[PDB]
From Swiss-Prot:
Catalytic activity: Couples ATP hydrolysis with the unwinding of duplex DNA by translocating in the 3'-5' direction; ATP + H2O = ADP + phosphate + H(+)
Keyword Ribosomal protein: no
Enzyme Commission code: 5.6.2.4
Keywords: ATP-binding, DNA-binding, Helicase, Hydrolase, Isomerase, Late protein, Nucleotide-binding
Documented activity regulation: Unwinding activity is strongly stimulated by single-stranded binding protein gp32, the ssDNA annealing activity is partially inhibited by gp32 and strongly inhibited by ATP-gamma-S. Another study did not find gp32 stimulation of helicase activity. Holliday junction (HJ) branch migration is inhibited by ATP-gamma-S.
GO-annotated molecular function: ATP binding; DNA binding; helicase activity; hydrolase activity
Binding site for ATP: 135-142
EC category name: isomerase
Protein's name according to its UniProt entry: ATP-dependent DNA helicase uvsW
Cofactors (names): Mg(2+)
Residue span, Helicase ATP-binding domain: 122-280
Chain positions of motif DEAH box: 232-235
Taxonomic source organism: Enterobacteria phage T4 (Bacteriophage T4)
């Protein structure tokens, strides 16, 4: 063929082609330098101001290899690519989930599980070896890094290098790693200013954490020990820095750059892709963001409720003053972020109860179900305009019929549905009819009043389920099947 791409090492692939093909490629893999007008080589020399990532030694940063395909389709060339360049991990999604399920991950003393977008990021990173994980600062990348690092540790012999922006984050990263209980401080060597008085003894630690400023001062050889490398908030990484260590990471089979601000990067996207591989945004589904909140009740309340019919249980829970207070608080909290929330209720005694708690602590609150139109669209317009921190307490009826609702950021289901999720279709519909933002999050409250087993030798979490819990679980299973964007959280009512 015209072009042959051979496996060199884990930092670069090597190209063999005609000298003519070489120069076309050399211009392909280039971009306009930032501030090139201030460079004297440009103003008085022979520089055109572009930077070329493909030098005469014919070595191309590993992560840009997938772009060769595009080069050929654009210049009508045929190329052969060494299969070991596209080698993937022998890891099925089933084994991954199995591995994940057997892990005891914590947050303080509470056992927890990774959100879907976190698992998909880890899985994608792992299977493809090198990738830029495009995720916001929320969505805890901390755990994502810990899982990637954990996997490596259990399957390979090299060390894992993690680069963060500041020394404070150096510490935060380490502390989080132990918090999850996936690593111990003895396994994590902090370098540079983030080091503790005992990091000097940790020469064999499988995990090294530091800043670009420190890492860049290390000798080429030092980099041979890492099999995996990660850079959190990699958009703060400069091309100079990347180019400085790129060649030392020759055995670094796994590389990840994590960021949710790729558009504010010091370096050019091309430079990032060459070092970390292509971009993967987990935010993928098949609009609505669902938050399943497990509201746990006092064990004693749990024991008294047992035996009550569905109709009775709804009466009891819905009328509970503390639950009304909890919801009000959730609403307020959400509004204080200059965001608008919708508190859905069914029975007026409930709605007003909730409305009065809020009002006795927050002004921008509106009750809606009466004066059906004139005052209804009035509010619906106060929101559509651009008001912020507006909590509106309405009934499922109101918001279904007369629609518009633009700036709607949150919808709090104060009256749990049944085992069906149609309400979501409705919310989804109404929002994607007259208004936009459509990235509203729905808070699905599940009232967990399940009864714990007497013995500790019971392999069940609960021995008895109240109805609202069964329903919430039915709803969760439905979100999974329908592959919705959902997350689960637990909170004690008291």
């Amino acid at each position: 063929m015209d072009i042959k791409v051979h496996f060199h090492d884990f930092s670069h692939v090597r190209i063999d082609c005609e000298e003519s093909t070489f120069h076309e490629l050399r211009d392909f893999f280039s971009f306009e330098a930032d501030g090139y007008r201030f460079n004297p080589r440009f103003r008085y020399g022979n520089w055109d101001g572009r930077i070329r990532l493909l030098d005469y030694n014919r070595l191309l940063p590993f992560g840009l290899v997938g772009q060769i395909k595009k080069f050929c389709d654009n210049f009508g060339y045929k190329a052969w690519i060494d299969p070991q360049i596209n080698e993937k991990e022998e890891l099925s999604r089933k084994d991954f989930d199995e591995w994940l399920s057997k892990l005891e991950i914590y947050s303080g003393n509470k056992r927890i599980e990774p959100h879907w977008y976190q698992k998909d990021a880890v899985f994608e990173g792992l299977v493809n070896r090198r990738r830029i994980l495009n995720l916001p600062t929320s969505a805890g990348r901390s755990l994502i890094q810990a899982l990637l690092a954990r996997y490596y540790l259990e399957n390979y012999e090299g060390k894992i290098l993690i680069i963060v922006p500041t020394t404070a984050l150096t510490t935060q990263m380490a502390d989080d790693f132990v918090d999850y209980r996936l690593f111990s401080h003895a396994m994590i060597k902090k370098i540079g200013g983030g080091a503790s008085k005992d990091d000097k003894y940790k020469n064999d630690a499988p995990v090294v954490v530091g800043t670009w400023q420190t890492v860049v001062k290390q000798p080429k050889e030092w980099f041979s020990q890492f099999g995996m490398m990660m850079n959190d908030e990699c958009h703060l990484a400069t091309g100079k820095s990347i180019s400085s260590i790129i060649s030392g990471l020759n055995n670094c089979m796994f590389k990840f750059g994590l960021s949710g601000s790729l558009r504010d990067g010091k370096a050019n996207i091309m430079q990032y892709v060459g070092m970390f591989g292509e971009i993967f945004k987990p935010v993928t589904t098949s609009e609505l963001k669902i938050n399943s909140i497990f509201l746990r009740y006092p064990d004693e309340f749990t024991t008294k409720l047992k035996g009550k019919t569905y109709q009775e249980e709804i009466k009891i829970i819905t009328g509970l003053s503390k639950r009304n207070k909890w919801i009000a608080k959730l609403a307020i909290k959400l509004a204080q972020k200059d965001e608008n929330a919708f508190v859905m209720f069914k029975h007026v005694s409930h709605g007003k109860a909730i409305f009065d708690l809020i009002k006795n602590e927050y002004d921008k609150v509106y009750y809606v179900s009466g004066e059906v139109d004139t005052e209804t669209r009035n509010i619906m317009k106060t929101l559509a305009e651009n008001g912020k921190g507006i909590i509106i307490v309405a009934s499922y009826g109101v918001f279904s019929t007369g629609i518009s609702v633009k700036n709607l950021h949150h919808v709090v289901l104060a009256h749990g549905v049944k085992s069906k999720i149609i309400v979501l279709q409705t919310i989804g519909r109404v929002l994607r009819k007259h208004g936009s933002k459509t990235i509203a999050t729905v808070w699905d409250l599940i009232d967990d009043a399940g009864v714990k087993p007497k013995s500790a030798n019971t392999k069940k979490k609960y021995v008895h389920l109240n109805y609202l819990l069964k329903h919430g679980i039915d709803r969760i299973q439905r979100y999974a099947d329908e592959k919705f964007n959902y997350v689960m959280k637990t909170v004690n009512l008291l």
